[PDB]
Amino acid sequence: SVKVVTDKCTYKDNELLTKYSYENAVVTKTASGRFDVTPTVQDYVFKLDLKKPEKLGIMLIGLGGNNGSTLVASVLANKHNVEFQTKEGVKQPNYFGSMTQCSTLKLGIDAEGNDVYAPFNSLLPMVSPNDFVVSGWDINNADLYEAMQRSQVLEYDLQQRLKAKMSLVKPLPSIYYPDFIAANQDERANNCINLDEKGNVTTRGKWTHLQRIRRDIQNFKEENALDKVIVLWTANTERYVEVSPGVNDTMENLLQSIKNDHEEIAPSTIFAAASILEGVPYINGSPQNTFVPGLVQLAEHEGTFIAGDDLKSGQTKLKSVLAQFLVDAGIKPVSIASYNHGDSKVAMDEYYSELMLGGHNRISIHNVCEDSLLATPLIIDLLVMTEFCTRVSYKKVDPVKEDAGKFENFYPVLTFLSYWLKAPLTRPGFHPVNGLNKQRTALENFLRLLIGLPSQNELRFEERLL
Amino acid sequence: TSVKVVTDKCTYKDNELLTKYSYENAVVTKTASGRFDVTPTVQDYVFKLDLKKPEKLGIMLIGLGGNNGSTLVASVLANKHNVEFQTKEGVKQPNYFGSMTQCSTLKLGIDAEGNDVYAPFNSLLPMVSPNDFVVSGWDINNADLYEAMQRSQVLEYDLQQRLKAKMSLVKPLPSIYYPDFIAANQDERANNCINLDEKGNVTTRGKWTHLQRIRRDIQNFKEENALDKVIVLWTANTERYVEVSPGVNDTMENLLQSIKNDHEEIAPSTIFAAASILEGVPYINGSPQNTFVPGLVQLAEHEGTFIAGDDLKSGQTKLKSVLAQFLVDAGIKPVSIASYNHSKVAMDEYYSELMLGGHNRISIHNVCEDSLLATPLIIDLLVMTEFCTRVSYKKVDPVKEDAGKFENFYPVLTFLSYWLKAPLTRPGFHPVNGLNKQRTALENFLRLLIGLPSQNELRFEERLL
Amino acid sequence: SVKVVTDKCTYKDNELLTKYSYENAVVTKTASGRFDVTPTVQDYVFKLDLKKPEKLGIMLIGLGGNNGSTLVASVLANKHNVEFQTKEGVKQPNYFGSMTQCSTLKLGIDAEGNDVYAPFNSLLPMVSPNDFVVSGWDINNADLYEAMQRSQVLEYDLQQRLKAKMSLVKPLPSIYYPDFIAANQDERANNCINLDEKGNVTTRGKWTHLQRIRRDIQNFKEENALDKVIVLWTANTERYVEVSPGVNDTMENLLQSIKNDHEEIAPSTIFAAASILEGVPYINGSPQNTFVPGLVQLAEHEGTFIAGDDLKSGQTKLKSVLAQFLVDAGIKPVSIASYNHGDSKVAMDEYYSELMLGGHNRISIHNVCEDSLLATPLIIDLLVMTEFCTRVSYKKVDPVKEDAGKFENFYPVLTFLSYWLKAPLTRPGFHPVNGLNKQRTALENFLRLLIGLPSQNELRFEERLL
Amino acid sequence: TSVKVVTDKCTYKDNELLTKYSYENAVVTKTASGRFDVTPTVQDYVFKLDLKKPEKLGIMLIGLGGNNGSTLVASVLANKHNVEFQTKEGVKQPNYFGSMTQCSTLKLGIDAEGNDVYAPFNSLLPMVSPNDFVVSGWDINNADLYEAMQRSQVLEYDLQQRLKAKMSLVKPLPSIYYPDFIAANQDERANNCINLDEKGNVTTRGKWTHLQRIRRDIQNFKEENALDKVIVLWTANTERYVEVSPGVNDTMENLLQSIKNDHEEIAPSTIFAAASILEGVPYINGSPQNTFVPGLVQLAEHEGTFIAGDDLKSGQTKLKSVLAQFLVDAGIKPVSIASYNHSKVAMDEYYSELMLGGHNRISIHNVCEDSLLATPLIIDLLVMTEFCTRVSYKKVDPVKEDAGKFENFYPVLTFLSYWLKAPLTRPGFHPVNGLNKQRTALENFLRLLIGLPSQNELRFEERLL
Lengths: 466, 465, 466, 465
Ligand SMILES: NC(=O)c1ccc[n+]([C@@H]2O[C@H](COP(=O)([O-])OP(=O)(O)OC[C@H]3O[C@@H](n4cnc5c(N)ncnc54)[C@H](O)[C@@H]3O)[C@@H](O)[C@H]2O)c1
Ligand SMILES: NC(=O)c1ccc[n+]([C@@H]2O[C@H](COP(=O)([O-])OP(=O)(O)OC[C@H]3O[C@@H](n4cnc5c(N)ncnc54)[C@H](O)[C@@H]3O)[C@@H](O)[C@H]2O)c1
Ligand SMILES: NC(=O)c1ccc[n+]([C@@H]2O[C@H](COP(=O)([O-])OP(=O)(O)OC[C@H]3O[C@@H](n4cnc5c(N)ncnc54)[C@H](O)[C@@H]3O)[C@@H](O)[C@H]2O)c1
Ligand SMILES: NC(=O)c1ccc[n+]([C@@H]2O[C@H](COP(=O)([O-])OP(=O)(O)OC[C@H]3O[C@@H](n4cnc5c(N)ncnc54)[C@H](O)[C@@H]3O)[C@@H](O)[C@H]2O)c1
Known about the structure:
The structure is a homotetramer.
Chain A: E1 2-4, E2 9-11, E3 15-21, E4 24-29, E5 35-40, E6 43-49, E7 56-61, H1 66-79, E8 84-86, E9 89-91, H2 99-102, E10 104-108, E11 116-119, E12 132-137, H3 144-151, H4 156-161, H5 163-166, E13 181-183, H6 206-223, E14 229-233, E15 237-238, H7 251-260, H8 267-277, E16 282-284, H9 293-302, E17 306-308, H10 314-328, E18 332-336, E19 345-354, E20 360-369, H11 372-389, E21 392-394, E22 396-397, E23 408-409, H12 436-450, H13 461-464
Parallel strand pairs in A: 7-12, 7-14, 14-16, 16-17
Antiparallel strand pairs in A: 2-3, 3-6, 4-5, 6-21, 6-22, 8-9, 10-11, 13-15, 18-19, 19-20, 21-23
The complex binds nicotinamide-adenine-dinucleotide (4 copies).
Enzyme class (chains A, C): isomerase
Protein name (chains A, C): Inositol-3-phosphate synthase
GO molecular function, one term (chains A, C): inositol-3-phosphate synthase activity
């Protein structure tokens, strides 16, 4: 734990109230060249619900896949201390690869002026992956032990020690329309709600599917005595949907198209619409425009969290880091080749860059690891961060009128999660932000701010000029 | 390209800028158990930034005839005269690619729809461009720079030919040669030394006279070229480390004595360094090795002369550190990092532990003639230590303050840490390193200087209602 | 030069006559397991025309491409000693990358028993690349200097020193049918014979095209006072052709389809048919079935050399070497990934192989170089070897009837060149042979044999048992 | 799987095969200028191949408790008992992958339509399978093989558990420990040594008695297990080279003396070697280092005992050599070859010159636990030196001959050169190396043995009319 001697924070009824001065700057560029930078300010009073649910309910769509199954296993492994045998000895479970669970943040310096970091989840209170209550859907009924089997991600022994328990977790029938599977459809569709009472699939009753899914969420909520719940798409990858004026452009139409069983309405569209109606945060972990404007509207209306559009591969991450550092130092990357072979894949991206005076630079990144062992911890983080956000709200403080604010909620598309997605969906007029490093500080500073610490600046003036 | 920020923390006398900045930080004290107590600290300053930048800057390179050196001189003339050159891939315009000061940009703020607005790194305040450099220097080998550029087979053939007329005119000054000190990094023979005895043969006797010639040398260069501001940078061999002792190189009085006693522990490096200090020309040691022993540092603190320190980041070590960092910022536990090193080639193998017995292996293979990397880095280094020389700071206590009298940066330019592998320092402070962070320093200091907050990445305008 | 004290070789009228005992073995496999190996023998009298043309005429189709232009330049560079300046100093021309010009062969041992090799072209007399007289076609009229320019393969300076001369080499109009360009069509078709007298291309007059091409070869032959000529396809890569019963299955039909301007008749088909009619060796350096059965028939009839089906990339070569060595040692390659970005390309093939006891082996090959600098010397070799073959003929000697042989010519599809092609076309009932190493020895032994030396055996008994 | 070639160069007495072979070769003498004069040479032999192969072969490993050793013993039992094991990728049948004798094939001839016919490498003649091995050995560490296999974290966990009952029963014999000789390769402490003085502490005194215990040890193993044929292979540490001198290890008389004088230059290796010779058991040195000094070689020539020599090819050095060779067989001029080396990882960078100033860069990155590579290689080594032990040759002069009396192979099994990085030899002959070639030797010798020509790749049946 950490606590800061500051006057900008007061603990109410198990609620942190923080005043933050939001400095920024507007700049215009003159039809000549010159940039005119007009600074900016806007104080805020942030309210952090200080009580983390004791048990967070999670509902994975594609719960039978490599990521879903290893997610459940990672929770069971850590919660129950189930150590497993390995070719390299006996090993304790952990959560390596997770930012919430294993990375740290700088708090400040010490007597001698040397940096001092603390667990990324030590500052403010966050829910533990170990307190996750998972279940979900999957268009295939294998159970999670059998799921762990076909994925071949975990160690034989480990898989064995979780068998008894994971043979018990059974995914619910999901909704499966055939024309939308654009890929990542490893298993057969033998567990579906959507069956014309004869036995077939069919794309009819799309609204009834939505209701079924909504009811699903409600029942799951009670069977576990859970208040907060969070759904997340980790299934196959579908075909993008053609947003057309009248079907999925505005709220009114989206819902409407569903009842009509419009064809542009896809499985994820429903799970998303359902999640939203139940006011439960929905995360799109796969590439695809499930979040058409129409659905987005709905979210804005219900005032319920959404995020997503691809889990950030540990390769598409490392590609960002590398390419940025490059431009940041003045090199002009002029070419970018590729590789890529779930579990145990090989990635290789090569950069042919320009140096000064006709020179060139050839950089090659070779990457091998089991995908899911990276995608899973990253899923843990998303869930853990959209949980914390859901408990934060802010207030716009007017400098010449004490206490002029009615506490509001994070604009719906939590862009704060971007660090973990490839295509950061975004508010209507903004250009998305990538660049792992920037995306992380944003999060680090947000957390600094809530406990009253300033934006990290690294100027370290207590040495650069004594 | 110019930048004008509408603030009030900035007052412009005339060719003298005063800026008010509030340095927020924190001290923490974890104690008994796992609880960190942070006490935020503030300390106000007023930064004076002398707006007058030298129209011509003198750059004196030790190792002028080597790979870095010849290509430095080459890129100056080539960029300055827009001398295009032919290649198999077509005609090519010279540039300064690989220079942070010259080719990278910065985010100042946003615009009408939220999208960031970037601007040239050298646009903000006012900096000396490399095109207006005038360079000379020393080297233990007399070959002029057409030949040197010829040896250092780094530049395209045609380009070396369009530059032959001008580069031939440049010849390094005789240097100081103490054979036992040359650990490594000398690809060329020594036929240009000032330390010749009363018989013409390389001596280690008379080091103080060697020190004087270097000053005479520094003085002459400024005189013969107008130039008032001049900076020396060692880019020569890498000598064998010197052993730090008492009564020799510990103080500022017996380092001057030691030199006079022709005592050992005084490497060519030491002399050049001290000579640079004694003339108020900041000195940059771009190669690994002590040099900046304790004694020397004093001499520079006194006299008020800046000094940048120890070695200069490779374009793979400045990629190793960021690759490793990225990993550790995602919760991955590197277990092993192995490094190749060699156009030349570098390889780094990272085996880091994943979750539940899983493992990940990343392989970074890097290829390029690193002088095209080291050179733009040398420029940056020079431009930046120049800027830092027109900036004095004022430590203010808001309810009194420091009743006027600015201070130059603590001699050691630990701002230049983005360009040196072994960031020099002053006692007790654990060296930093952290490219991303280190660069974030220069951006923030370039910002506050003109009244800018120091960037956060919260985008409340977008994430907040 | 080399000369061997042996009784199996006699020099006639500037003609080597060699007796060779061709040992081999037939084996059947019993419906049980056992292999019954019935050895074999068949003596031969080989006749080698000992006089190499003073000037060999070469006609490249795609003479304007990266390979064609750098081929001409490599000949001009070496013949005229034109040294060029480089970033690394002044360099003399050479023929690195060529087996005929730069590799060696073991002849035998010495006083102390240490191996002794000799230039691969020192044994018997072969024509020098420096004595090549090149010209050819290209569906684009840039001249070869301009050709050298757009390819960017050679050093600026070198390109400059060959400018005067190469601005003089101008490719002839070629035949260009649009529907056959499946790829590698970097330049525009502005130099074609096939133009309906109006100005367009059209696919009519296919036979007249053949005649034009034949006449082309004849004129080239005389304008240079050349006897021997060799055409080679080094142009774009076309669409495979559908061999159908009646158009290109037998000779009679092929020729026929041409007159008919059948659509299955493609540009390479004609250059090939023409080459054959003129009895000049035709080499197919690109992937594509230009050699349909019908064309093959024709070759068999005229008794004229053919070979080809892709130039062997220095990567598809290195892939063979590696994969073989692997199986040869018992490893079971189970996977093979890929890369590939002419000039300056990057290849990367990765092998995931199985070791004993569930173990695995991960091998990755990364390759970067300018393609053409490898493809060109390899083109030199093909030309140099199909030239030598063209001067060899053999005789079947019957062991119980002195001198029963009428000297014959190499079966038409010189499979001896395979070492340099990817898809080694082959005689009707045989399964092609790859495996660079085997493919090379075959050539080494053939040459050994002609000068009377036995098949290399490496048993080195003068030490393994004294 | 059996092979029966219809020839007449092969006569089968009964469990004794005689083969007639004509060894064609050539001597050449380049002289004045560039002209090679080759004079073809012939020398006829009769090869006797004792058809009786041991039903059980004793394998004594020095270093039995190490990585190679435990996995050797493991693969024997696992293959022999068809003990399948579980993995994340499913249940897996044990095998002998990586063994040339066990899993690679050969071309004997063609068939009805020209297409080659391949057959198992161990099908031709008759060889001892690894499944019928009986292994014991020494190691300076007493840990039994369940534990050893446990340390050497090379085998899958489940597989180590299905083999725990049997591997626990096996414990290495006490070895010989001379601390100063251990250059490197000892990952484990020494708590199992026979060279303890009259007080129980490791001595270097009494080397001859150490030599005797090794024989007693060899004798016992054969007795206690029936076995008549037994082969020892050093797969222990790699010791510091020994210095060759006069009156100590030069002859066969003062190497026996030296040992008795407890003289130095006698490494544990030397003793094991000599002990193996003195019992007629062939000895295989699978690690770099002299050992096979000159003296020792004599002792083995005498006594008629085979000896395989120096180190054992890595699965990357046995890929470096072939990669380089391939390049040089295409006319490319390697200029630089750089080697990494580390499951473990290896990297090789080849920069070779192309035509007209062009350059090519090949990068070979290799990964795998190399014991799964070294182990099958050890098997092969053993199977093959066994075969070579049932083959005597007869040097015949066709118009007289050698009026009967075969000869064993010259002690040094330079046939095993495909498996050893530093192919040992006898004076004057420049070491060979050339994987492809070296393997082509074994194929040709396996061929002639049964009356086959020795393969050419001319395919006159296809290329000839
Ligand atoms: N960034 C990374 O490193 C990384 C790695 C692996 C997967 N991913 C992402 O995760 C997704 C797949 O994850 P995975 O590794 O478990 O793959 P997977 O191949 O196991 O597929 C996920 C599971 O989803 C189920 N599914 C498919 N369609 C469904 C539907 N309409 N409704 C409910 N369940 C459905 C499948 O049966 C399967 O078991 C992909 O979208 C992919 O982009 C990212
Ligand atoms: N660590 C890095 O990434 C990095 C990158 C670039 C340069 N450097 C530093 O730059 C220096 C040389 O680098 P380079 O690429 O130009 O190599 P280089 O091969 O051109 O050698 C430097 C030049 O200095 C001259 N010289 C040698 N000893 C001298 C002496 N005692 N006094 C004066 N001149 C001397 C040489 O003749 C040569 O021309 C070294 O100090 C090196 O450590 C380090
Ligand atoms: N193995 C290797 O490393 C390697 C490398 C490069 C090219 N190749 C082979 O060579 C061929 C192309 O060679 P390149 O490197 O010169 O490429 P390129 O891109 O320069 O194309 C060859 C030339 O052929 C000409 N051409 C195209 N179609 C023609 C036609 N119908 N008639 C006459 N000329 C025609 C083009 O205009 C071009 O200039 C391809 O088939 C390719 O497979 C192999
Ligand atoms: N060059 C190669 O590619 C290659 C490949 C495989 C093995 N080798 C050789 O095999 C040996 C070990 O290889 P490994 O992979 O099994 O390693 P390892 O780490 O298992 O060590 C060998 C074993 O020998 C034992 N040992 C050490 N010193 C000894 C001594 N003086 N007398 C008896 N036993 C002793 C050790 O305790 C250990 O169990 C070395 O000699 C090595 O050079 C070389």
